[PDB]
Amino acid sequence: ELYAIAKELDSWFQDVTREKAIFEILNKSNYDTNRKILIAEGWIPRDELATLQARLGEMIARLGIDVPSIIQVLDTNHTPPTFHRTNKFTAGFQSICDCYGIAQYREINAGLPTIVTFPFMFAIMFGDMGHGFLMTLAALSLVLNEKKINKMKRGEIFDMAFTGRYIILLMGVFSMYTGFLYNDIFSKTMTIFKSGWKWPDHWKKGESITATSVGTYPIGLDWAWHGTENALLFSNSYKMKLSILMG
């Protein structure tokens, strides 16, 4: 009997959990025993009134209730809640944005600009190709297996990262960009693009050598700056100005 009941017990629990909420909700409806034609209110998305009315009518026809069901919109003097029909593409960004504070009744939800600004603000702070690439692979580990992870307990292995599959992906691709524009796979600078500063062709064994501005490096910080005694000063001035301008 235990083996027999175990098959339906798991489904029976999730079935029976419904009515608790059902009666807790219709509790707010104020269905007095003497009163008939129960009257109540609730918050809906305005663009879904027609579809909810259609579904209710379809159910009433299915339920055989001869009396028609009607619904009317009140004068919304009281402030209604704020909603955002976010998809899985941006639900993480929206939730992280609203962690600070829920939006005003109809204001411009800050989630939408943050969707991009937060990953790029992180990336302009992060920089490296290699670390960003490994963390982008880590993000792919949850993005690709999103179907599997959705039905497996987050626990302490992922925890808040359960929703972070797409956030980490976008900050990783922006880390890629910041690497292209800071020119450092991990720390080491790459040299695909055209040669930058041309330090003088004749050099002594240990002489101090300056460089010549023969041109401008097209994409990002000039690889010639690497290893130089003025590299820290140049890069720091550069990215002070970059930070303040972007800010």
Binding site: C99, G101, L232, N236
Partner: protein
């Protein structure tokens, strides 16, 4: 060993450049310690408010950011032949920013602990706590502005 450029000139420059990060780091550390105790106390009871309540520790990290910026800016003016004026000004700027950041760290930590405690119970004290932290942070901002002025003229037409 020039009269205006003595050999012991860069000692003050190095001391200022370091102190600009030591004192700011101490202020930031005290701030984040007090704020973190507050966060732990409020979140063992009210776990959901954690991420929302993390801001005071950020504003403690402000002091460390300011120390880093002033330290590197002072360092870029260092030089073996630097005059005594340059070392003097770098020392003064480093002490000014570092101790302003230390005061900012004390303020940040104390009010962060108090505000975290308060927001644990009452919901809309958080905005006031944030603005008080804003004033505590802008204190370090005044310190940084002073340090930037000194460093800006640290090598202004120096003989």
């Amino acid at each position: 060993m020039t009269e205006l450029c003595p050999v012991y000139a860069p000692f003050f420059g190095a001391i200022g450049c370091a102190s600009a990060i030591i004192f700011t780091s101490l202020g930031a550390a005290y701030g984040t310690a007090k704020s973190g105790v507050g966060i732990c106390a409020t979140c063992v009871l009210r776990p959901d408010l954690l991420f929302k309540n993390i801001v005071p520790v950020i504003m403690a990290g402000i002091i460390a950011i300011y120390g880093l910026v002033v330290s590197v800016l002072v360092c870029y003016s260092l030089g073996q032949k630097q005059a005594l004026y340059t070392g003097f000004i770098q020392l003064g700027a480093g002490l000014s920013v570092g101790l302003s950041g230390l005061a900012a760290g004390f303020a940040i930590g104390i009010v962060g602990d108090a505000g975290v405690r308060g927001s644990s119970q009452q919901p809309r004290l958080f905005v006031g706590m944030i603005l008080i932290l804003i004033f505590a942070e802008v204190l370090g901002l005044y310190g940084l502005i002073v340090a930037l002025l000194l460093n800006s003229r640290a090598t202004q037409d120096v003989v």
